[PDB]
């Protein structure tokens, strides 16, 4: 077709005008209609059998790189892994099996806590991650002169934490492991600002990974200073079958990538029937409140106004015999809260509202495909 294939020469030469007769418009409906269960059947056979023996031998080669990375984490370098393929099974085998026992032995008993962080999850929140880090470090919380008139308490406590840890002994006491640092909810500027200032602290060791090809566009001179990555290419052509769970693969990637409701569809498939009857009751009651309050077909994502309050919800699931009391209700709610499939917050009157963060069209699709089959 084109004479040039790669340079700016190939960019300028392949972006030509195609004529209307020269366009061969074939709809993708002219294809074998593939069921979802045989999609998973053929994919799990090729991902577990096609090139294991090259990928296993490649993983034995780059396992000899592990003391060379550990020498870099003891010198204050954050450590970014790029390449083509899934880097997830590499990253949590290096950081849990190799890295964490060998820092602890070199500081002489228990291992270093290894907070790993799934950034391919589109529901990854930076305030919940920082809630986890202050449980592990237990920093001195922020005095009144330090909270500077609606200052950001997450950023202003890291800056107190840097000045504290500039005088502590140089010992790794946390390893935060960021899978897909350029993932959908973690590529935002408030998340990167958190993790850059948190990377200045030499007492915690950053081990991160990126999949997108324009990932270095995400760090300017100030963020690349605080990070000071050393970059490592680990191409291994792994399938990424866990990253292809929060995002529908039957639609080839036009599932909007930031919903999180497609990843919720995977969570419902292996639950209790009494935990699916509750969540079905929660969806159907909020679906009543979205069609009432909005008066609008178009996609608005469900928030606190459309949510059920908690004491009214306990009456709904006691008549349908899901929950016997308030505590057994709250014990099977929190498994949805930790996966952020349901949120609990209070309004301006004290009503404790429970609500599902998905749009109306994603809420009726989810109600029919997994929940209403019983």
């Amino acid at each position: 077709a084109s004479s040039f294939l790669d340079t700016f020469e190939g960019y300028f030469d392949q972006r030509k005008i195609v004529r209307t007769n020269a366009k061969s418009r074939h709809t993708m409906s002219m294809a074998p209609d593939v069921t979802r269960e045989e999609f998973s059947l053929v994919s799990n056979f090729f991902n577990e059998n096609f090139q294991k023996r090259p990928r296993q031998k490649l993983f034995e080669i780059q396992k000899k790189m592990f003391p060379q990375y550990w020498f870099e984490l003891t010198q204050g370098f954050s450590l970014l892994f790029y390449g083509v393929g899934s880097k997830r099974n590499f990253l949590e085998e290096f950081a849990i099996d190799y890295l964490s026992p060998k820092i602890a032995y070199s500081q002489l008993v228990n291992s270093i806590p290894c907070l790993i962080l799934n950034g391919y999850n589109p529901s990854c929140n930076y305030r919940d991650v920082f809630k986890e880090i202050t449980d592990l470090l237990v920093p001195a919380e922020l005095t009144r002169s330090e909270t500077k008139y609606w200052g950001n308490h997450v950023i202003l406590q890291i800056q107190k934490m840097i000045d504290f840890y500039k005088n502590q002994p140089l010992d790794i006491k946390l390893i935060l492991v960021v899978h897909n640092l350029d993932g959908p909810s973690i590529r935002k500027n408030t998340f990167q600002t958190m993790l850059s200032f948190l990377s200045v602290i030499r007492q915690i060791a950053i081990v991160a990974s990126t999949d997108h090809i324009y990932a270095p566009l995400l760090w300017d001179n100030m963020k690349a200073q605080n990070y000071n990555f050393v970059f490592h290419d680990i191409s291994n052509f792994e399938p990424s079958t866990v990253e292809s769970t929060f995002q529908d693969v039957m639609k080839m990637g036009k599932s909007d990538t930031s919903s999180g409701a497609e990843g919720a569809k995977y969570v419902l498939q292996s639950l209790t029937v009494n935990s699916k009857k509750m969540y079905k009751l929660l969806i159907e009651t909020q679906m009543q409140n979205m069609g009432n309050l909005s008066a609008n077909t178009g996609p608005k994502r469900g928030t606190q106004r459309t949510g059920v309050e908690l004491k009214l919800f306990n009456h709904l699931c006691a008549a349908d015999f899901i929950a016997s009391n308030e505590i057994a209700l709250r014990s099977m709610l929190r498994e949805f809260i930790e996966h952020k499939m349901a949120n609990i917050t209070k309004n301006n009157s004290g009503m404790e509202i429970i609500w599902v963060p998905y749009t109306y069209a994603e809420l009726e699709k989810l109600l029919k495909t997994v929940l209403n089959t019983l």
Partner: protein, 583 residues
């Protein structure tokens, strides 16, 4: 509820009982397992005393770049006694990073409050004032040892409520990131505090880029207010090179007499430090550390820079140092000058004593370029009053021999170019004690061609996956592995040879013709255990369905890498390519 589907879970991993060893250092045994354990731990602690001696001085340097900058801004913030007394003294800090603290005077019978405003703290003009009036009322009760409305009426009631007059200082942090409608309206708001007879305002602008960009943004009547007294103070780590010359000289003091710097390394330092002009000194330190980390990790001869370990010398050391290219040039020089064979044979390995006695001679030379560069930099400083020079490219042109061809640009060293002349001499065995990048490790680890390493692994992929020959005829798919590419690598060359907008279905058929039809269906049948998978294989439609399943997880993997746009939502039939190789 798997942990793989959660966000941010915490592992408390299990550590084994005891691995029988005090081997917990990241250095490995070199010489393919011929190096002793006592050499590995010696090379570890000889690294840390050469690493810490470098960072004890760099931390001393960085503490001087702030103590100088606190004092240079404080000479200029105070004592400009204007006789008109109805304006503010403005301090433009050209190119300043907003990470400098400003200490104000104590200076009793006067309050000196410092009010710092970031562009995140400035969404609009009333939020600039309610934070500024909170920061002075909170910092005046801190020095005092009822409530006030936070507005500019606190400035007029300041003597009537605290008894001392005021001197407030504004420190705008990222003024290139603030919008200039708000900062213009706030300077005009502070202009209304010049009727109160007991206050003086002082603005400090941390302009990271330019003054010419700022005066095109502010309105013209504000610049006429900012010009009654302003002071431009150039604040940079890169001005006059005077702090980059101190960190690089601090590096050459640590490796004086024990490590050399190749000019291929020094001009790499010199080129990469010019591509980042705002943060040079952290990036100068990062490259000198990672090359120093690289040396002690890879050279078994790293233990031979202190003379007490020369009495250890072994046989595998003797087989590896003699392939030094200067050492062959020395034996070549003894061939061409002295005809007989025995003195050259006493140098080589057939005399077991002589070669290891030959290496103890050449470790003690000073190798005097490290002191002579410090000699030139001090002499060219105080004699000629020259400030604007790199010591880095002075050290680079000194390694080559182009010293006087570098000094002629100042046109005042013509009476001194003969006494400063120095031709370097190639010492023997200097390749074993040196810092160089001829392998390409620093421009792969610190400065990688990121996207070009992605498309090369996609397109080529033979450099990545091992092509093995014995083990494949045993396994389930090794008849398929020699004839079929990995699907991300197969789809990328169909991606590469295509035009901008491509139909998915035509891109599916063009993918499908590349695959072997008989051996995919032979591979899908070679597992006898899955009954559900063998039922798909009996269908006549088996290859057309396996090819689509295998296509549309790679057309999915190319989207979240960013290689493919789905043009024109509501249509979902054709895609646009984002990424070209080579760019």
């Amino acid at each position: 509820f798997a942990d793989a589907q959660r966000s941010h879970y915490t592992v408390y991993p299990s550590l084994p009982q005891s691995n029988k060893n005090d081997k917990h250092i990241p250095f490995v045994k070199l010489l393919s397992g011929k190096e002793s354990e006592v050499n590995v731990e010696k090379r570890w602690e000889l690294y840390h005393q050469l690493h810490s001696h470098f960072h004890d001085q760099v931390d001393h340097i960085i503490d001087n770049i702030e103590a100088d900058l606190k004092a240079e801004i404080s000479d200029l913030l105070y004592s400009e006694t204007t006789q008109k007394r109805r304006c503010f003294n403005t301090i433009f800090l050209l190119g300043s990073d907003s990470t400098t603290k400003i200490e104000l005077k104590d200076e009793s019978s006067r309050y000196n409050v410092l009010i710092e405003l970031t562009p995140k703290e400035s969404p609009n003009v009333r939020m600039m004032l309610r934070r500024s009036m909170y920061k002075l009322y909170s910092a005046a009760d801190a020095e005092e040892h009822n409530d006030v409305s936070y507005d500019l009426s606190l400035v007029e009631n300041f003597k009537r409520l605290f008894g001392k007059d005021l001197a407030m200082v504004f420190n705008f942090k990222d003024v290139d990131s603030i919008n200039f409608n708000t900062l213009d309206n706030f300077i005009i708001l502070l202009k209304s505090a010049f009727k109160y007879d007991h206050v003086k305002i002082s603005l400090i602008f941390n302009i990271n880029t330019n003054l010419s960009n700022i005066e095109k943004n502010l309105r013209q009547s504000t610049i006429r207010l900012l010009k009654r007294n302003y002071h431009k103070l150039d604040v940079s780590s890169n001005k006059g090179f005077k702090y980059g010359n101190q960190i690089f000289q601090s590096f050459l003091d640590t490796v004086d007499g024990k490590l050399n710097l190749s000019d291929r390394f020094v001009e790499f330092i010199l080129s990469k430090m010019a591509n980042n002009t705002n943060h040079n000194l952290q990036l100068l330190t990062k490259m000198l550390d990672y090359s120093l980390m690289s040396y002690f990790f890879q050279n078994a001869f790293s233990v031979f820079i202190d003379p007490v370990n020369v009495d250890f010398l072994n046989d595998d050391y003797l087989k590896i140092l003699s392939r030094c290219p200067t050492f062959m040039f020395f034996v070549e020089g003894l061939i061409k000058q002295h005809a007989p064979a025995d003195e050259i044979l006493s140098l080589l390995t057939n005399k077991n004593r002589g070669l290891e006695e030959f290496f103890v001679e050449f470790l003690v030379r000073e190798n005097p370029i490290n002191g002579h560069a410090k000699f030139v930099a001090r002499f060219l400083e105080e004699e000629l009053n020259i400030t604007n020079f790199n010591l880095i490219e002075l050290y680079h042109n000194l390694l080559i021999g182009k010293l006087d061809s570098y000094l002629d640009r100042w046109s005042a060293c013509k009476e001194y170019k003969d006494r400063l002349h120095f031709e370097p001499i190639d010492t023997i065995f200097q390749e074993l004690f040196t810092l160089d990048n001829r392998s390409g490790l620093l421009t792969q680890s610190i400065f990688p061609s990121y996207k070009s390493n992605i498309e090369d692994n996609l397109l080529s992929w033979e450099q990545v996956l091992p092509s093995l020959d014995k083990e494949n005829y045993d396994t389930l798919s090794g008849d398929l592995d020699k004839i079929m590419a990995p699907v991300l690598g197969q789809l990328f060359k169909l991606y590469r040879e295509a035009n901008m907008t491509i139909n998915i279905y035509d891109f599916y058929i063009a993918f499908r013709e590349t695959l072997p039809k008989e051996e995919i269906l032979n591979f899908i049948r070679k597992d006898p255990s899955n009954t559900k998978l063998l039922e798909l294989a009996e269908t006549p439609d088996a290859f057309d369905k396996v090819a689509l399943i295998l296509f549309m997880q790679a057309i999915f993997a190319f989207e979240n890498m960013g290689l493919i746009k789905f043009q024109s939502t509501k249509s979902y039939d054709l895609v646009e390519k984002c990424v070209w190789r080579g760019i």
